[PDB]
Symmetry: D2
Subunit: 292 residues, 4 copies
């Protein structure tokens, strides 16, 4: 599933920094129970940055195992070298994931033709559906609507997670792609506006802690009930902003711990423990949302 | 060691995309002959991003072999995970490199305290001298003067490559660090200005194809002869700009091939061959510098 | 009227730079005939910048005279000194304008409290409805949603022309103001998106040359017929961008001349005549729109 | 004339918002005693934006009277309409001012060719020396090096106030103009750096309250003693920043009142009285500079 509220799930860790299956099993049950449409496993919020390839495969396979067919799983699979992106992607064919979320090459700042070739080659070498992932603030490059339109012709490239927060991109992309190409917000604070403009869902950090409200909000949005959806979004808005008061996923792992969803809020360096000030800001956002 | 003109050397490849030893030798001889002060091996311009860790180490070890004690070698050693940066760096202990050019974590956008902990831990697990590298346009992370000041107190953190192009950083950093902390430009177009403000040298892309001019500019600058240095700078200023007309190292590899310094201009995807228009542009810049 | 398509009308000039009543009368008849909801007289596109106060009053009074009750007129009335804004505004009370379009103070970059006091004082000293006008790219200051919410409580401050092109502002403002506060786009290229998000109309430059299409597009938007409106907007999109290929109102006065709506495209220094390249870009946009 | 420390002098007012002659005299005596090189009368810091043309001229004429030949006076003379800039400037012919500080048109955002024509025409209708003033953060217009180069060929266009804070502009401009074209900083926080790169002085806000320190810094800089100059700079650096903690001239007027240099800190709307928090901030900056 590639519509509705999709959670960019945390990778819960014990005090040592190792994946905590008990915590993960709890999150997964919570998402099944709360009507989340799918799980993005080891994406940005899942600390894709800092897991090695072994860990990355382990988490994805463990998520699929615990999900046990109850909710679709999408793997985070980008790389900034094309041959490596192909190679990492091969390892997930026939795994049970429904699709891949693949980020623009980061650091090396390719041209639009380079992005075209990169994503075209990745799609050529798998049967899996590919969701493009654009987030210039993290990668230093911006996948533009024209090039998205070129890529959407590739049978396997089925949508985009647009994380710029630039809402003009929704209809610039939509007019260049087919009615079945999925547009998903990657920016929680603007995601309702993004849906109102014609987007189909969100790949959400807030959904880690407000899964039911997010699923209801996205459903109402899909039905065209924007004023109703916006009541929910207003109660979530502090969390949509304050889950980024320190670098993601520091605030959201702290909030998960606070709600009892995971055992510890431990992360891997260079992510640091939440400051005291951050914890007060996040606590207040959680209370505004009604979760505390 | 870490002063004057330091080349951010290209990793010349064959048509297959593997390192071309004959070409690397020719480049390294060219730098020894030209007066280049040191070589940064497999940094950004050297396609750090698209070589695996073994290929990377093979290139460094080869560069060191070919250098044969005639010119110091600094290895590119970034990682966006601290445990990993430490391992990756440990491999070069006792290699013969004189230092590491270690980039800020990219993509995961750590806090300043995160950056402090990451570099402090790297430095604690090696005796290799470490040069910090700040390039927010590639990384999404900006290592601020205050944090550089904190890090410069670590024994083996010995300097910074400041690739922002923001000249105000030179004196901000310089007043927070001791007199032997090395300040190097990572932005060719502003490097002479950077040295005029108290900088000590440059890790240069332009030096790949103008190694003598760059070594002479930097000597003039260190001796206070800025008017004279600026004459060379004006000759090179179109290179300094047009070597980025397409994503680095696309232009500089072409230029190297056109000057006969390397056999092929092949790069790895997502870097793409230079366009016709980029070629005419870079060619006019080489003519203007009198290299062609 | 403060909904629908409102034209930011040009001030047509003879070869000497003086207002051309014949040309103005033609534009006004054209807007009456084409279903434009209102006319903004001497706003940004009307060269408010370069008319003295005498000329400014003359143009507004001449527009009201020629309009002859057939279409409502709104005057451009900002100043960057509060006492002067009050004083200029007094001169229009009982003139027959339906309202004023008043820009944030430009150049002196006041604080949000300063903007609050400025606009509050202007509204206090007239009975005329006031439309706030936010355009940071021209003024150097950005009127934020919070402060808009404070001002919308003032009986007389009835809406905003939001010219940032930042579509997140639509619902940030809407949730802070009453359902009768009017939100109008000041950015043609994003104005349809702005309406889709909950805005009520546009204060448009494109409407100078595509008045009927703009009025139909805004009407369909108000009815919730976004796909229908977007067909029109796609044919106008080149014009929405290329009317700013050189500084407004250079392109749009050239286009008016080309369509026979005004006698000359003359403007006042520091606005310059359209270049040859600009005229080709604009001509093509006009043909894309179906006007040539 | 146009070198060393030039004060962007405040227009001190009484409680009514009119110029306070006793305060202006005290300031002008303070500058003669302190070694300030010249006074910019009714520029940005002098509330050029909120005085009418007659009030403006009254302040200049008074400043000149009070200066009584002991210190050169430069008048602020911008307009965003060329015909008007010419008239406004003509009024000072034969006044006794030594030059005009003429700002780029603000709000209407002219092309570079427009800026060329505007300043060329101003210069053609006066024999007063003209200093260009580039401050895109206030004006929305950026006068580029290439255009400054074209203008510096006009006989009486004699220098530039570069208030961008972008130090790369110093040598870009310097290589395009003759050796007697004056390059002045308009950004206190970067001014010593600016002179280190070849700049000749600064039109300073900080000099209102630290006139001796600023005159001594600038002399040290012109004599090549940058380390010594930087000591003074570090003393003043919190002023250089915190005099903009609220919109200029709000902080500097308060500071002037606290040091006893002016009777009141009154400004005209839309400038607002300093907040409590801004006051404590500016007070700590004055203590740090040893002025308090
Ligand atoms: K497709
Ligand atoms: K050190
Ligand atoms: K109201
Ligand atoms: K001149």
């Amino acid at each position: 599933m590639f519509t509705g509220s999709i959670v960019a799930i945390v990778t819960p860790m014990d005090e040592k920094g190792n994946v905590c299956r008990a915590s993960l099993k709890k999150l997964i049950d919570y998402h099944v129970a709360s009507g989340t449409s799918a799980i993005v496993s080891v994406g940005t919020t899942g600390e894709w940055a800092t897991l090695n390839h072994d860990e990355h495969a382990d988490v994805v396979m463990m998520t699929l195992d615990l999900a046990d067919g109850r909710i679709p799983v999408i793997a985070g699979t980008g790389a900034n070298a094309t041959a490596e992106a192909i190679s990492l992607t091969q390892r997930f064919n026939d795994s049970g994931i429904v699709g891949c979320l693949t980020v623009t090459p980061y650091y090396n700042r390719p041209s639009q033709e380079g992005l075209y070739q990169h994503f075209k080659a990745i799609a050529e070498h798998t049967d899996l559906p590919q969701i493009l992932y654009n987030v210039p603030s993290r990668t230093g490059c911006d996948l533009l609507p024209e090039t998205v339109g070129r890529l959407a012709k590739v049978k396997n490239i089925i949508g985009i997670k647009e994380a710029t927060g630039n809402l003009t991109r929704v209809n610039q992309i939509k007019e260049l792609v087919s009615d079945d190409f999925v547009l998903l917000s990657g920016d929680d604070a603007s995601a309702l506006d993004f849906m109102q403009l014609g987007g189909h869902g969100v790949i959400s950090v807030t959904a880690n802690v407000a899964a039911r409200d997010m699923a209801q909000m996205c459903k109402l949005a899909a039905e065209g009930h924007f004023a109703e959806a916006r009541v929910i979004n207003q109660r979530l808005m502090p969390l949509h902003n304050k889950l980024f008061v320190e670098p993601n996923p520091i605030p959201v792992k702290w909030a998960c711990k606070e709600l009892g969803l995971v055992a510890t809020d431990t992360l891997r360096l260079p992510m640091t423990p939440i400051t005291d000030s951050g914890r007060e800001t996040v606590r207040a956002a959680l209370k505004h949302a009604g979760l505390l």
